[PDB]
Design a protein around this ligand. Structure first.
Ligand SMILES: *[C@@H]1O[C@H](CO)[C@@H](O[C@@H]2O[C@H](CO)[C@@H](O[C@@H]3O[C@H](CO[C@H]4O[C@H](CO)[C@@H](O)[C@H](O)[C@@H]4O)[C@@H](O)[C@H](O[C@H]4O[C@H](CO)[C@@H](O)[C@H](O)[C@@H]4O)[C@@H]3O)[C@H](O)[C@H]2NC(C)=O)[C@H](O)[C@H]1NC(C)=O
Ligand SMILES: *[C@@H]1O[C@H](CO)[C@@H](O[C@@H]2O[C@H](CO)[C@@H](O[C@@H]3O[C@H](CO[C@H]4O[C@H](CO)[C@@H](O)[C@H](O)[C@@H]4O)[C@@H](O)[C@H](O[C@H]4O[C@H](CO)[C@@H](O)[C@H](O)[C@@H]4O)[C@@H]3O)[C@H](O)[C@H]2NC(C)=O)[C@H](O)[C@H]1NC(C)=O
Ligand SMILES: *[C@@H]1O[C@H](CO)[C@@H](O[C@@H]2O[C@H](CO)[C@@H](O[C@@H]3O[C@H](CO)[C@@H](O)[C@H](O)[C@@H]3O)[C@H](O)[C@H]2NC(C)=O)[C@H](O)[C@H]1NC(C)=O
Ligand SMILES: *[C@@H]1O[C@H](CO)[C@@H](O[C@@H]2O[C@H](CO)[C@@H](O[C@@H]3O[C@H](CO)[C@@H](O)[C@H](O)[C@@H]3O)[C@H](O)[C@H]2NC(C)=O)[C@H](O)[C@H]1NC(C)=O
Ligand SMILES: CC(=O)N[C@@H]1[C@@H](O)[C@H](O[C@@H]2O[C@H](CO)[C@@H](O)[C@H](O)[C@H]2NC(C)=O)[C@@H](CO)O[C@H]1O
Ligand SMILES: CC(=O)N[C@@H]1[C@@H](O)[C@H](O[C@@H]2O[C@H](CO)[C@@H](O)[C@H](O)[C@H]2NC(C)=O)[C@@H](CO)O[C@H]1O
Ligand SMILES: CC(=O)N[C@@H]1[C@@H](O)[C@H](O[C@@H]2O[C@H](CO)[C@@H](O)[C@H](O)[C@H]2NC(C)=O)[C@@H](CO)O[C@H]1O
Ligand SMILES: CC(=O)N[C@@H]1[C@@H](O)[C@H](O[C@@H]2O[C@H](CO)[C@@H](O)[C@H](O)[C@H]2NC(C)=O)[C@@H](CO)O[C@H]1O
Ligand SMILES: *[C@@H]1O[C@H](CO)[C@@H](O[C@@H]2O[C@H](CO)[C@@H](O)[C@H](O)[C@H]2NC(C)=O)[C@H](O)[C@H]1NC(C)=O
Ligand SMILES: *[C@@H]1O[C@H](CO)[C@@H](O[C@@H]2O[C@H](CO)[C@@H](O)[C@H](O)[C@H]2NC(C)=O)[C@H](O)[C@H]1NC(C)=O
Ligand SMILES: *[C@@H]1O[C@H](CO)[C@@H](O[C@@H]2O[C@H](CO)[C@@H](O)[C@H](O)[C@H]2NC(C)=O)[C@H](O)[C@H]1NC(C)=O
Ligand SMILES: *[C@@H]1O[C@H](CO)[C@@H](O[C@@H]2O[C@H](CO)[C@@H](O)[C@H](O)[C@H]2NC(C)=O)[C@H](O)[C@H]1NC(C)=O
Ligand SMILES: CC(=O)N[C@@H]1[C@@H](O)[C@H](O)[C@@H](CO)O[C@H]1O
Ligand SMILES: CC(=O)N[C@@H]1[C@@H](O)[C@H](O)[C@@H](CO)O[C@H]1O
Ligand SMILES: CC(=O)N[C@@H]1[C@@H](O)[C@H](O)[C@@H](CO)O[C@H]1O
Ligand SMILES: CC(=O)N[C@@H]1[C@@H](O)[C@H](O)[C@@H](CO)O[C@H]1O
Ligand SMILES: CC(=O)N[C@@H]1[C@@H](O)[C@H](O)[C@@H](CO)O[C@H]1O
Ligand SMILES: *[C@@H]1O[C@H](CO)[C@@H](O)[C@H](O)[C@H]1NC(C)=O
Ligand SMILES: *[C@@H]1O[C@H](CO)[C@@H](O)[C@H](O)[C@H]1NC(C)=O
Ligand SMILES: *[C@@H]1O[C@H](CO)[C@@H](O)[C@H](O)[C@H]1NC(C)=O
Ligand SMILES: *[C@@H]1O[C@H](CO)[C@@H](O)[C@H](O)[C@H]1NC(C)=O
Ligand SMILES: *[C@@H]1O[C@H](CO)[C@@H](O)[C@H](O)[C@H]1NC(C)=O
Ligand SMILES: *[C@@H]1O[C@H](CO)[C@@H](O)[C@H](O)[C@H]1NC(C)=O
Ligand SMILES: *[C@@H]1O[C@H](CO)[C@@H](O)[C@H](O)[C@H]1NC(C)=O
Ligand SMILES: *[C@@H]1O[C@H](CO)[C@@H](O)[C@H](O)[C@H]1NC(C)=O
Ligand SMILES: *[C@@H]1O[C@H](CO)[C@@H](O)[C@H](O)[C@H]1NC(C)=O
Lengths: 430, 122, 128, 122, 430, 52
């Protein structure tokens, strides 16, 4: 009275490698599989499952892989360790110092020859040593610096993650799912939706919006050691710029070895900045507060304060756009108290060229200058907030792991393995 | 429709066995990882096939054995099992007997082949 | 006589009724110092996958272990309206494969269902 | 034990065949060796399965064929072979004939399948 | 009436990766897969197939592998970028100009020491900077220069290509096949014949000969943008030399880092050159014309003119012999008008050491000096010709891709994927 | 006997003496490919440790 069955529709939670696929240079090619233009999804009638976005290894892979490709892309590029020289430096001419005008003795195509080279630098990449004054590049005591190849794009082109044979991705259709626990409505796919590998700190600028209501998710909410992720159900328009018409020049420093230097600035010298719709932002916070109160009390006062101190990478909002790395003050966005019962916010931004991209030591990337003027428009889709921790609950914007920027898209997906072989009692015998 | 039977009861679900079976075989960075994935998928496929071979169920999605259900593995009525349970619930229900049943299936097949050899030699 | 063995593809130019005698010859040849050898590992793996897909289908259709199997699926005529006296005697397998290539998926789908029905019926009988 | 039957006589050892069969397939540099080893184990496994398929012995650990023994390969009595020899000794005893026996098995299976088709066509 | 069959003798054209094989250090230690001492060739009775040598992926693979192997062979070798310095330079010692006598201040095993060294150079590798005179190595402004390891040979030892399991190669036995379309007589092989991975430009120096008649093949003929590949039915004997007894010295430039420099010349200084049998050459051009006329008219006048201008790789006949790179002036071979109704030709040759082996930018190989006197003997088996484009049809020799030197052997082979599973109606039912 | 894995072996580097391997079970063992042929080495395994 036993029958063995094969093709049995069961699975177990499992961890495997997912592969990228894309909608058919830029880092985003590198042999990703052209994806399915008409992907299928199977609704699973009467199927529920437990999900946990905080234990989601799909996030772990996204993190791991982005870093690996980032590093791979710099392998063929010209090194800037030859620039660890003493520089003589002054300020860039303007009427009354964000930019530095520095000069040095550089190598040439011949090892026995020298040339005088001067260029413009952001002060944030330069350190004074001789307490013109003498300066060095701020990373020469710690890392090798590699120039990114100017021909390679880092644009966050969306990719899809697909399961290997023997695996499937289960996904939630529960619009109220909070990233954890039982998910009442489950379906399955071979591939996820396309996700843009956007790298940011305080704000999420190019992700998905909540289906209905602002969703606030956390590993705990009550645990002050954890982050709270806020997903907007509406975009907020943010317009960022680098309002300086720049030129670039190349220096031949060796045999086919080129260094890209800022030439000069055409016209006025102005600070980088971002414009956030003011009305939209206030309406957005009002919605966030209404939802935050669900865990703090209906008449609890919610305050938005600015960030804590530390490095710009953890105190400011940052992003890569137009090839430049922007650091924005953002305090103008978190300066209000919400108590129960057209215009814009202008945020100054700073720019840096030597980037410790993955918060690692010894591997620095140098962003070559971008010519012309940069204009970027993004969708604020969400925020990373922490509790500043008695009738007022104060939150501050802050940074977090890169993984938190991606679990925000992957929270609806889980990977399981298929186990088609099994048995059951029957009335038959051979 | 690969997991379409996932929420179905066992007696309804075991009709799509073919649908799932037919979908199981389907540089540096992004170089080696895909080769590793293919190899591991192959090993999984083959282990299942070897067991079906060992138990005398090769080439079938549904096969009967001559092993009795021993009751103690599950005392549920077969009408409860096939009509009011899904395969996922069921697999969990008896998961700790997997190795017992498999060992019995293996021994039975060995006895059957031995007897057939004696008969063909007769 | 003529020492007729023909060879691995053998008489690929012979008609189907003559050619389907060397099926085993081909089957037996389908499986056959530092770095960058990944190219060969990739080749080995892909050969394995091709082999397994063919074997799985023979399994699903109930033709596992055979080079030739009869099924209980009808020929539906529209696929090919040639007589068997024309198909087996005046056509090669290569010509034939081209002749009915557009029905590959039709026949295969029908084969899967027939086997599904056959196994279902066997279980009902063994449960009797 | 996997090779526990290794010193057993053939008539004693050919009962543990499943014990041996079930154990046949079982981040950086050198991961290629590991992958290579897995691939090679698969290839070995498949070649054996293919031959059993070709000879009509698929799914069995023991299969009788319709091919006669031709004596010159071994003139020992079956009782000498099965009771006073181990498989390892036997494997050496008839090593050189492997290709003859297999050629005969392959031919026989083709004739059998041809005849089955003629009967199903009748 | 459906019957399923497996082991069906059918195939589809397919692109796969072939592997190399070898019959008992570049090429020489590339053991690949050992070849079959007595390979089987199966004639396909009644079988015809279409071939296209101009679209043959096997050619693409030889390119892919040959280029890769040469790059790999330089991986462990000493870099010559340390030599990219200014050199003081004069003549050598001769009466009455290709060679130069140049000197420079080189590094030694210690960073604190320098040495005065000098060596002989060929004009083609050295460029004046101070428009004694000051010079630099000609490629130091744009590319890395790597010394080939002196212990490594590049002799074009023939290798075979073989299909992987699931694939087989179809081969033509058609002595008159023109490279495309149906091939009436074919056979199947697992492996191709051994092919010497020879690199050349204007002349094809060591291939196979046509069985009966000179064969002229082209992707189009009519379209003057295409090359014409001419396969002789008899070899032309060519004898090349670098008739200078040269010596070599090693220079220690760093810790285990050695540079190989030309020392001096024993005896007279003479030009490199090639000797082509005159009588044979005239006969082969006449044969070529008789066959060319099939596309131009029976009484059409055919003229052989010399090459067009450009780099030596396209204006001269180049080859690697003894490790030296020769650039021969083949204009002495193409001086004839053929109108319907013992001796030798000496071609001077230039010598270079810094070679852009695959005509790429940034990767230059330095050929270390070869000691002694070089003699090269080869079988010219064919030509690469183009139409100089009304009663006279003029042709000129010229260069082209390295791929064209390989399709010249590969035109007889095609690889297909074996597809053993299929169905047919019969009179049986289960 | 049959094993799938060997005992743990220390990947130790030394010249004249082996200072952390296995001891002989009963008696000092002397092994050589040949003994008679002086081109071969003699490997001596102790049945007792000597502390250094
Ligand atoms: C959040 O998501 C938004 C929307 O997807 C991103 O914004 C877009 O980012 C891309 C990439 O930077 C921007 O595209 C850039 O446009 C520059 C100007 O193009 C003009 O001319 C073309 C001609 O057809 C017009 O179509 C176009 O509208 C403009 O008029 C290009 O110069 C950029 O690169 C190209 O030129 C350079 C020149 O050297 C080359 O080096 C490059 O390889 C390439 O050829 C690029 O195309 C796009 O405009 C942005 N849109 C908006 C609304 O901003 C956000 O950036 C993203 N947020 C973050 C932080 O990434
Ligand atoms: C077309 O096909 C022809 C025929 O195969 C090729 O011509 C041959 O090319 C090879 C390689 O260049 C020639 O081989 C070389 O011969 C030199 C002289 O050999 C004689 O003298 C030495 C002195 O010690 C004797 O040992 C030897 O037995 C002979 O008597 C060798 O000196 C060359 O190098 C060898 O020694 C050095 C020493 O350090 C090693 O490093 C080398 O690896 C190698 O061992 C080399 O052997 C061969 O002679 C040529 N044949 C003819 C008839 O000339 C054409 O090159 C080919 N054309 C093209 C375009 O590929
Ligand atoms: C500081 O920034 C300036 C540019 O903003 C750097 O370049 C200097 O620019 C001035 C003005 O163009 C150059 O002066 C030139 O002098 C000649 C003298 O006859 C005159 O004919 C020209 O019209 C012009 O006035 C100056 O030479 C130029 N410097 C160099 C090295 O090219 C300046 O170098 C920057 N300083 C540092 C330390 O980076
Ligand atoms: C140009 O080529 C010559 C060799 O062809 C290079 O070497 C120089 O050769 C001359 C003649 O052999 C050397 O002069 C001799 O030196 C010995 C030393 O005791 C002396 O006894 C002789 O009377 C005679 O003077 C000369 O020194 C030698 N130079 C070096 C540096 O070795 C010459 O260097 C080459 N020049 C360049 C720029 O490459
Ligand atoms: C769902 C869950 O497990 N949440 C955890 C909290 O329960 C846990 O709460 C803490 O429990 C301690 C027990 O003595 C209390 O003293 C402590 O005040 C309390 N803190 C909070 C914020 O509730 C917190 C922190 O340990 O972690 C959550 O994960
Ligand atoms: C299907 C099955 O029986 N699986 C076994 C599990 O039930 C078993 O879990 C343990 O069951 C005991 C029964 O009283 C519980 O007391 C015990 O707490 C429980 N253990 C856990 C971790 O939940 C496990 C472990 O013994 O083995 C399975 O095979
Ligand atoms: C025996 C058999 O299956 N014959 C096939 C025909 O039935 C089929 O045509 C049929 O046309 C109808 C027109 O509305 C369709 O609704 C019907 O579904 C279709 N039948 C099937 C099985 O698809 C023809 C079409 O080429 O092929 C015959 O083989
Ligand atoms: C193209 C060329 O000149 N090759 C050289 C040969 O010419 C040369 O002469 C050969 O001498 C032999 C001695 O009897 C003759 O039999 C042979 O015919 C003759 N070859 C030719 C083409 O005439 C040989 C040296 O023996 O060296 C070649 O490189
Ligand atoms: C970012 O820039 C865009 C482009 O100029 C702004 O969108 C425009 O807003 C004006 C306001 O009246 C509209 O009339 C235009 O039609 C809008 N353009 C488009 C293409 O829709 C956008 O508002 C800016 N965002 C911020 C925060 O300033
Ligand atoms: C190729 O085609 C020829 C002609 O159809 C075949 O030759 C016939 O072969 C059969 C046996 O299969 C003989 O009975 C006939 O007498 C042959 N006819 C002629 C005119 O030769 C041939 O067998 C086919 N296959 C091959 C040759 O490989
Ligand atoms: C090329 O130069 C070499 C030296 O670099 C010559 O070698 C000579 O060989 C004879 C043979 O007995 C020796 O006695 C000489 O001492 C060698 N010379 C030296 C400097 O040692 C070689 O003969 C020369 N070859 C040609 C063709 O001229
Ligand atoms: C090949 O050799 C010829 C012959 O020397 C070179 O061309 C000659 O250049 C001189 C210079 O005035 C002319 O007088 C001759 O009449 C030219 N001869 C011919 C046939 O044109 C030719 O440039 C050399 N080509 C290469 C690539 O080196
Ligand atoms: C290009 C350049 O700045 N070179 C200066 C040189 O002019 C100066 O004389 C020396 C110290 O006096 O320091 C070098 O770096
Ligand atoms: C080039 C550079 O910035 N070096 C910094 C130094 O300025 C800084 O003071 C120190 C810690 O304070 O860490 C070094 O790496
Ligand atoms: C999707 C969802 O709401 N999940 C959990 C819920 O299961 C849990 O009960 C509650 C606290 O008890 O915290 C929510 O996040
Ligand atoms: C071989 C060579 O170039 N040597 C010169 C040396 O003669 C000169 O004296 C010195 C600077 O004075 O620079 C060295 O490079
Ligand atoms: C092998 C051969 O001759 N191939 C083609 C031939 O098929 C074609 O018809 C002709 C022009 O039509 O050009 C030839 O090259
Ligand atoms: C920002 O916060 C400071 C804190 O005192 C407050 O004074 C300031 O007015 C706030 N900004 C705006 C725009 O109100
Ligand atoms: C920068 O100035 C140059 C001057 O010719 C001009 O061509 C270019 O368009 C300017 N770029 C911008 C963004 O204004
Ligand atoms: C914001 O999201 C909407 C959704 O449709 C999209 O159309 C819009 O272009 C996005 N804007 C930006 C700046 O990404
Ligand atoms: C889901 O439950 C309902 C309850 O009646 C049932 O009718 C339906 O068929 C179930 N779906 C599945 C997949 O079993
Ligand atoms: C070894 O030989 C003895 C002799 O009687 C037998 O009893 C024992 O079972 C043998 N062992 C094996 C493995 O056959
Ligand atoms: C070689 O001699 C000629 C004679 O005029 C001279 O012009 C040339 O510059 C000399 N070469 C060098 C490197 O001096
Ligand atoms: C062709 O022959 C003539 C005869 O004088 C000669 O002058 C001319 O240079 C030759 N051309 C070539 C390319 O050899
Ligand atoms: C030229 O071809 C003939 C044909 O036998 C061969 O003997 C001779 O060695 C070949 N010459 C070269 C250099 O390969
Ligand atoms: C090593 O030192 C320890 C310390 O107690 C001692 O007991 C032991 O005998 C010493 N070994 C030797 C070889 O001296």
């Amino acid at each position: 009275w036993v029958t063995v069955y094969y093709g049995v529709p069961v699975w177990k939670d499992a961890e495997t490698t997912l592969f990228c696929a894309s909608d058919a240079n830029v880092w985003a090619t590198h042999c990703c599989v052209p994806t399915d233009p008409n992907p299928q999804e199977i609704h699973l009638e009467n199927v529920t499952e437990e999900f946990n976005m905080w234990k989601n290894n799909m996030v772990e892979q996204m993190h791991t892989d982005i870093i690996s490709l980032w590093d791979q892309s710099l392998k063929p590029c010209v090194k800037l360790t030859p620039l660890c020289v003493t520089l003589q430096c002054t300020n860039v001419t303007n009427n009354i110092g964000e930019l530095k005008n520095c000069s040095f003795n550089m190598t040439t195509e011949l090892r026995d020859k020298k040339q005088k080279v001067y260029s413009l630098f952001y002060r944030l990449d330069v350190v004074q040593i001789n307490e013109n004054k003498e300066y060095r590049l701020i990373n020469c005591n710690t890392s090798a610096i590699t120039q990114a190849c100017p021909k390679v794009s880092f644009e966050p082109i969306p990719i899809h993650y697909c399961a290997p044979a023997g695996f499937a991705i289960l996904k939630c259709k529960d619009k109220k799912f909070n990233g954890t626990g039982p998910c009442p409505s489950v379906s399955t796919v071979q591939c996820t939706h396309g996700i843009k590998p956007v790298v940011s700190t305080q704000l999420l600028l190019n992700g998905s919006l909540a289906e209905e209501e602002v969703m606030i998710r956390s590993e705990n909410i009550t645990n002050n050691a954890k982050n709270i992720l806020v997903q907007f159900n509406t975009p907020v328009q943010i317009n960022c710029t680098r309002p300086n018409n720049n030129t670039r020049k190349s220096i031949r420093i060796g045999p086919g070895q080129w260094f890209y230097a800022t030439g000069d600035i055409i016209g006025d010298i102005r600070q980088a900045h971002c414009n956030v719709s003011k009305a939209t932002w206030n309406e957005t916070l009002g919605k966030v507060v209404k939802q935050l109160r669900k865990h703090f009390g209906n008449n609890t006062i919610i305050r938005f304060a600015n960030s804590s101190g530390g490095d710009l990478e953890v105190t400011t909002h940052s992003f890569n756009c137009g090839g430049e790395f922007f650091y924005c003050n953002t305090s103008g966005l978190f300066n209000s108290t919400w108590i129960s019962n057209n215009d814009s916010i202008t945020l100054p931004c700073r720019i840096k060229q030597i980037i410790n991209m993955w918060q690692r030591i010894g591997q620095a990337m140098y962003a070559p200058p971008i010519q012309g003027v940069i204009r970027c428009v993004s969708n604020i889709t969400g925020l990373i907030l922490t509790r500043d921790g008695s009738t007022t609950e104060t939150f501050r914007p802050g940074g977090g792991d890169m993984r938190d920027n991606w679990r925000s898209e992957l929270y609806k997906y889980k990977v399981v393995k298929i186990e088609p072989l099994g048995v059951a009692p029957t009335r038959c015998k051979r | 429709g690969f997991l379409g039977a996932a929420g179905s009861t066992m007696g309804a679900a075991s009709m799509t066995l073919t649908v799932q079976a037919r979908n199981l075989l389907s540089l540096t960075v992004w170089g080696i990882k895909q080769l590793q994935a293919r190899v591991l998928a192959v090993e999984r496929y083959l282990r299942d096939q070897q067991l079906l071979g060992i138990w005398g169920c090769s080439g079938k999605l549904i096969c009967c054995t001559n092993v009795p259900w021993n009751s103690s593995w599950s005392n549920r009525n077969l009408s409860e099992i096939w009509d009011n349970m899904t395969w996922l619930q069921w697999d969990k229900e008896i998961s700790n007997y997997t190795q017992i049943i498999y060992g019995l299936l293996e021994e039975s097949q060995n006895q059957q082949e031995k007897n057939e050899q004696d008969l063909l030699a007769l």
